[PDB]
Amino acid sequence: TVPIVEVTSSFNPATFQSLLIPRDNRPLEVGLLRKVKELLAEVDARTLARHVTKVDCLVARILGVTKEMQTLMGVRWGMELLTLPHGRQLRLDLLERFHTMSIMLAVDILGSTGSAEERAALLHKTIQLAAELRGTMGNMFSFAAVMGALDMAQISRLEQTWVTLRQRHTEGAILYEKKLKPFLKSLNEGKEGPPLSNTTFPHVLPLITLLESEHGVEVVLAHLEAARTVAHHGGLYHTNAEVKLQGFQARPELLEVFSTEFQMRLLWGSQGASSSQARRYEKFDKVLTALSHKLEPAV
C-alpha cells in the first residue's frame, strides 16, 4: 500500500515531444546538433551551470518535490531515496543521466570541426562549466559528468586541441590539471568533500555505482558512511538549491538541451533511444572514437 517501488524508468524518450525534437527523428541530425551547439554557445559557462543544476536537482528530487511525491517514496528527499533498496530506479536514472550528459558534452566538442583552435576555446569553456558547477553551483553531480566528458579517451587524445589549450588558455589548462582533476580524485577516494554549506548536489556517484552490482574495503566503507550524512541532509541541499536559484530566469530551450530525454532522442534518435543502455553506450563509444580520429588522425 503506502510507499511504492518504481519498477520502470522515469525517463521515456519515445514519448518526448518538442519543437526541437519532432515525432520521428534521426540520430545526430545535423541541423539539431547545430541548434544545440548554437544554444550552448549563446551563453556563458555560469548560466550553462545554473541551467543544468536546476534540471539535475529536479531529476534527483532535490527540487520540485510535492508531499504526494514524498508519500509515494516513503521519504522526503531523493538523496535519502537513493540509499534505500527501492531507490533502485532513481539510481539507475541518475546513471543514465550522468553518462548520457558526458556523451552530449563530448559530441559538441567533436562537433567543433572548425579547427583545433576553435575546439580549444570550446574545451576551455567546458572546463569553465566544470569549475562553475563545482564552485558557484556546488553541484558535484554535473561537475563530475563534465569532467567525465573532458576525460573520455576520445577527447583527451585531441593533442592539437590540448596543446593549443595550453598555449591560448593557459589559466584554464592549469585549473583543470592542477585543481579540478585532483579534487574529483579525492571525492572518489572518499576524501573530504565540498563544504556542506555551499552544496546543492553532493557527490553520490561512487555510492550509486556500488549499490548497483574497484574500490578497496576501506573507501567502500567510506562512501557508505558518508552516504548517511548525505541522506540526513536532504533538506539542506534542497534549501541551498532553492536559495541559489531564487530569481533564476531560465531559458526554456536551454532546459530542453540539458534534459536526458532530449539527449537520448538527440543522440540515438527515436527507436534508437529505446534500445538498452549497454547497446546505446557501446555503439556511441565507437562513434566518438571515429569522430575523434577524423578530427585529429593518429597514423
Binding site: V2, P3, R76, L84, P85, L221, A231, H232
Partner: protein, 134 residues
C-alpha cells in the same frame, strides 16, 4: 502510519537478507579453505555492502517513524550495525596484514558472526514493533 512503514521496510530488509546470508556464507568458506587476502578481503567488501543496506533502512525508519519508542529502537540498531561494520573492516585489515594468521582470521570471523546475530535481532525487533501496533 508507523505500522505501514515497519511492515514495508521489514519486507525490504527481508528481500536483502538472502544476499547477505549468501555473502556471509561465501566469506566463511574462503576463510575455511585458507584463501589469501586478495580473496577474503573481496568477500568482506560484499558482506559489508549487503549489511549496510540495513543501516540505511534503519536510518530512514529513524527519520519517518512518529512513535518515539520506534525511533529509539532503530537508531540504536543502525548505529550498532555500523560499529560492527567498522570492526569487520578493522579485523579484516589485521587478517591481511598478518596473513597467514589463524587467530587474526578468527577475530575477523567473530565480527562477521556478531553481524549475523545483530541483523537477525534487528529484523526481529522490526517485526515485534510492527506487531505491537494494532
Amino acid at each position: 502510519s508507523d505500522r505501514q512503514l515497519l511492515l514495508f521496510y521489514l519486507e525490504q530488509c527481508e528481500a536483502n537478507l538472502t544476499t547477505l546470508t549468501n555473502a556471509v556464507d561465501a566469506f566463511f568458506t574462503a576463510v575455511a579453505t585458507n584463501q589469501p587476502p586478495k580473496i577474503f578481503v573481496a568477500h568482506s567488501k560484499f558482506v559489508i555492502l549487503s549489511a549496510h543496506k540495513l543501516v540505511f533502512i534503519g536510518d530512514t525508519l529513524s527519520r519517518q517513524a512518529k512513535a518515539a519508542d520506534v525511533r529509539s529502537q532503530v537508531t540504536h540498531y543502525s548505529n550498532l550495525l555500523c560499529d560492527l561494520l567498522r570492526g569487520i573492516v578493522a579485523t579484516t585489515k589485521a587478517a591481511a596484514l598478518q596473513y597467514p594468521s589463524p587467530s587474526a582470521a578468527q577475530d575477523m570471523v567473530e565480527r562477521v558472526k556478531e553481524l549475523g546475530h545483530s541483523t537477525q535481532q534487528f529484523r526481529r525487533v522490526l517485526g515485534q514493533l510492527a506487531a505491537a501496533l494494532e
